[PDB]
From a paper:
The rate-limiting enzyme of ethylene biosynthesis is 1-aminocyclopropane-1-carboxylate (ACC) synthase (ACS), which is generally believed to be a single-activity enzyme evolving from aspartate aminotransferases. All ACS proteins contain a conserved aspartate aminotransferase (AAT)–like domain and belong to the α superfamily of pyridoxal-5′-phosphate (PLP)–dependent enzymes. AtACS7 is one of the genuine ACS enzymes of ethylene biosynthesis in Arabidopsis, catalyzing the conversion of SAM to ACC through α,γ-elimination (top).
The two dimers (chain A and B dimer and chain C and D dimer) exhibit almost identical structures, with a root mean square deviation (RMSD) of 0.76 Å, and both have the classic AAT-like folding. The structures of the two subunits are nearly the same, with an RMSD of 0.44 Å. Arg293 and Arg419 form salt bridges with the carboxyl group and phosphate group of PPG, respectively. The overall and the active site structures of the two ACSs are almost identical, with the RMSD (for the Cα atoms) of 0.83 Å in the overall structure comparison and 0.176 Å in the active-site residue comparison. The result showed that the amide group of Q98 directly approached the sulfur atom of SAM.
Numbering used by the authors:
A (entry chain B): 13 to 76, 91 to 445
B (entry chain A): 15 to 72, 91 to 442
Write the structure that this text describes.
C-alpha cells in the first residue's frame, strides 16, 4: 500500500511558489525593513499594493446586520452592485456605463480570471496573453482549468505593446500546432508595464477577436490608477460605440477593489460581461467564491458617495503619478532608465546594461545582488515572461515617502560603486 | 457567434432542476407577513434563523491583510469553536485551519485536490442536491451514489459501500474517496459511531479519502449523539488511517451567517493542508469578516451558551413541525439534527415513480404555495420523500405553512 493519493492538480507546481516572485517576498519576511529598529532590513518593492491614498478612507469612515448575515444570493447585494457599477463609471469618466444587473462579484480578480477561464476555454485550449504579464496568471489561468497560456510577444521597439503581426503570429503558430485558441486576455493598463493600451490597439485587437471568433478579456484592475483619466481607454468605451450585440458578446471585463482602493484583504472582485450567457453562467459559478455580504454592505454606501468617489479617484491618480515621478527621477539621477509609464503601482525599470550578456541567468544573478546586498525585493522581468532580460518591476505605492527615498539612496549608492 | 466551454454550456450548474425551479417560483410571489401572507413560503432552503437574536444581543491593517493563512486570531477562534461544538472530544490545531468562502467552496476545492477529472467520489443517497454542481461542475469528477433505503433510516451499510465501489469499477471509473454529510442533509440524522468506523475501514482498505462535511455539527439536538470523524481520528494511532480524513465546516448553518461566506477545511493530511491553502487564494474570506468574527468566536463564554441554546431551539422547532405534520396525517423519518425534516408523502403518489413525485411536488408549489424539495432531487432511491426546511422562518410563518398542508389532506 502507498500513501493515499492526491490529484494531478494537487501535486503540480502550477501553484507558482517555486519562483523568484515568491522567493523574494519570502526573503522579505525573514528580515523586514523598519524605519525605527531595522533600517538595514529588506524594503518591500515586489508587491503591487496601494497605500498612498489610504488615509482618505480612514478620514472618511471616521466622519460617519441580520439582513446581510442571511444574504448569500449569488447576484450579490443589489445596493453594492450599484455602488460597484457607479464606481467603475467614475473611473472611466462617463465614457462608459455599467448595468448593475450584469455585475458578478468574486473573491478578488484572482477568482474572476480563473472563473472566466473556466467559462471561455476547455482544458488543453489556450488563451493569448501579451508579454510581459502578471506572474500570477500562470497559476490563476492554468492551475485548475487545464487551460494553457500562449504568449503574444512584445519587445521594447514599441514599448512592449501588441502589434497585429504578433497577434497573428501567436494565433497562427498555435493553430498550426493544433492548439485551439479561445481568446486574448490583456491587462489594461498593464501589469508590470504600468502603461495604458492605446485606443487603436484595442480596436484592432477587438477586430482581430471578431475575425478569429475568439474572446477578449480585459483585466482592468489598475484602471482607477491611470495617472490621467483621458489617457485610459477601457474596452467598455470601445464596445459602448457598437450596438452590434454580436460584437459585444465576446468582451469581458475583470475588475477588483484591491489596487485602486487599497482593500486587497476584503476580496472584492467583479466580472462585467457583455455576453448574457457568460453573465448567467459566471454568476452561478460565483457561488464558489462569493464576497462577504458584510463588506458588500460596508462598502456600498462609501462607493455610492459620488462626492467622495470623485475626490478619492482624482486624488489617487495624482499621488500615484507623484510617486512614479519621484522614483523615475530618482533612478535617472542614478543613471537608470524606466519605461515611460502612465498608470499603476509600479515602474518598469531597465537594468539590462548592467548584465553579463543578455541571458536569463544573468538577470537572476543581478536580482540576487539587489535582494542580498541592497536588501530590496523587486521582481525580475523574466518571471513576467519579458522577451528581453534585465528589466525589473519596482513597486512604489506600498511605502512611506522616506522609505522610498532610502530605497533610492541604496540604488544610487550601488551605481556609484559599479561605474 | 462565440463559443463557450463545455463547462459553460453544461447542465451541471444544476438549475434546470426542482430544487432551483421551486426556489425560483418563491421569488415571483414571496410570502410576507405584513403585505402578502398568501405568498410562497420558503421551506426548500436550509438556513438557520432560530438563534440569531443571540448574536444581535452580542482598519488599515485588516484591509491590507490578504494572506492565505488567514488571521491567526480567527483560525484560533474557528478551532476552539469547533472543539466546543464537539464537547472537547476532539482538538483542532489552529495552524491547520484553511479558510474558504463557505463550505460550497471547501468541498469543490477538496474535490480538485483529491480526485482527477473523470474519477469519482462515492456519496450516500439521499444527498444535498448542491453536490451535483459543487463536486462535478468545474472538477470533471463524477458522483457514484451509495444507495440507502428506509429500512435502516437511510444509513450506510458496509455492503452498500462495496457494491457502490464495484459499480464504478464496471464503468472503468476510479474511486478516489467517499464524501459524507455528518450529520446528514437531507435526513437530519447523526451517523452512528460504528457506521463511521466501518466507513473509515473501507476507506483504508480501498486506500481512498473520506471527506466529512460537518456543517450541521452544531445543530445536533443532543450533543452526545453526534460523532465527528475528528473524534474517531483523535483515538486512532495509525497515521495511514488519519492521513485520508478531511473535515469541511462552515458558519453558515450553525451560526446563521451564510452571507459572510466562512468555510474551513481541517485536513489531517499535511499536503492537503498546504495545497488547500494555496488553492484558497481563489476563494479567500474577507479579512474584515475574519476580524469581526475572531473576537466573537473566541469568547468561549458566549459560544458555549450559543451552541447549547441553538441545539435546544432547533430541537423544539423540529418538534413543532414534526408534530404539526403528524396532526395532518404525515410521517417524518426519525431525525435528530439539522435544519430540515425528511417527510414521506409516498402514499399520495399517482404511480410510485419519479414523474409522479414531481407532479405531486408541483401541487404543493402551486396550490399550497410551498417550496419543498422533492427527494428525487436528492437522488433518494425511494420515491415520494420530501425535504422540508423548518429553521428559515418565524414561529408564525411555520404555523401558517402547516395549516396549508393540513387543509390539503382534507
Ligand atoms: C493584473 C492583476 N490581476 C489580478 C490580480 C489579483 O488581485 P486581487 O483582486 O485578487 O486582489 C493582480 C494582483 N497583483 C499582484 C498580486 C499580488 O499578490 C496577491 C494576490 N491576490 C501583484 O503583486 O502584481 C493583478 O496584478
Ligand atoms: C452539506 C452542505 N454543505 C455545504 C453547503 C453550502 O454551505 P455554505 O457554502 O454556505 O457554507 C450546504 C448548503 N445547503 C443548502 C444551502 C443552499 O443555499 C443556496 C446554495 N445552493 C441547502 O439548502 O441544502 C450544505 O447543505
Amino acid at each position: 500500500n502507498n500513501n493515499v493519493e492526491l490529484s494531478r492538480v494537487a501535486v503540480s507546481d502550477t501553484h507558482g511558489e517555486d519562483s523568484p516572485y515568491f522567493a523574494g517576498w519570502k526573503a522579505y519576511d525573514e528580515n523586514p525593513y523598519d524605519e525605527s529598529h531595522n533600517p538595514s532590513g529588506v524594503i518591500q518593492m515586489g508587491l503591487a499594493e496601494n497605500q498612498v491614498s489610504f488615509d482618505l478612507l480612514e478620514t472618511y469612515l471616521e466622519k460617519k446586520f441580520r439582513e446581510n448575515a442571511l444574504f448569500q444570493d449569488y447576484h450579490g447585494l443589489k445596493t453594492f452592485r450599484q455602488a460597484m457599477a457607479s464606481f467603475m463609471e467614475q473611473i472611466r469618466g462617463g465614457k462608459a456605463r455599467f448595468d448593475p444587473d450584469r455585475i458578478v462579484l468574486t473573491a478578488g480578480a484572482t477568482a474572476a480570471n480563473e472563473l472566466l477561464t473556466f467559462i471561455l476555454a476547455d482544458p488543453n485550449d489556450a488563451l493569448l496573453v501579451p508579454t510581459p504579464y502578471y506572474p500570477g496568471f500562470d497559476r490563476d489561468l492554468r492551475w485548475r482549468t487545464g487551460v494553457k497560456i500562449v504568449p503574444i510577444h512584445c519587445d521594447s521597439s514599441n514599448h512592449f505593446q501588441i502589434t497585429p503581426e504578433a497577434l497573428e503570429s501567436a494565433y497562427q503558430t498555435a493553430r498550426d500546432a493544433n492548439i485551439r485558441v479561445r481568446g486574448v486576455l490583456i491587462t489594461n493598463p498593464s501589469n508590470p508595464l504600468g502603461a495604458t493600451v492605446q485606443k487603436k490597439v484595442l480596436e484592432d485587437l477587438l477586430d482581430f477577436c471578431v475575425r478569429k471568433n475568439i474572446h477578449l478579456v480585459s483585466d482592468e484592475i489598475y484602471s482607477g490608477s491611470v495617472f490621467h483619466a483621458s489617457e485610459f481607454t477601457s474596452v467598455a468605451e470601445i464596445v459602448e460605440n457598437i450596438d452590434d450585440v454580436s460584437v459585444k458578446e465576446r468582451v469581458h471585463i475583470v475588475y477588483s477593489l484591491s489596487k485602486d482602493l487599497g482593500l486587497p484583504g476584503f476580496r472584492v472582485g467583479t466580472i462585467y460581461s457583455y455576453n448574457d450567457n457568460v453573465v448567467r453562467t459566471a454568476r452561478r459559478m460565483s457561488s464558489f467564491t462569493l464576497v462577504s455580504s458584510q463588506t458588500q454592505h460596508m462598502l456600498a454606501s462609501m462607493l455610492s458617495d459620488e462626492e467622495f468617489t470623485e475626490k478619492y479617484i482624482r486624488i489617487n491618480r495624482e499621488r500615484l503619478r507623484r510617486r512614479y515621478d519621484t522614483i523615475v527621477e530618482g533612478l535617472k539621477k542614478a543613471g537608470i532608465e524606466c519605461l515611460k509609464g502612465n498608470a499603476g503601482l509600479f515602474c518598469w525599470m531597465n537594468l539590462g546594461f548592467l548584465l553579463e550578456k543578455k541571458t536569463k541567468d544573468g538577470e537572476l544573478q543581478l536580482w540576487d545582488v539587489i535582494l542580498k546586498e541592497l536588501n530590496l525585493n523587486i521582481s525580475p522581468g523574466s518571471s513576467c515572461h519579458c522577451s528581453e532580460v534585465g528589466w525589473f518591476r519596482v513597486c512604489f505605492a506600498n511605502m512611506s515617502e522616506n522609505t522610498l527615498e532610502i530605497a533610492l539612496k541604496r540604488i544610487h549608492e550601488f551605481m556609484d560603486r559599479r561605474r
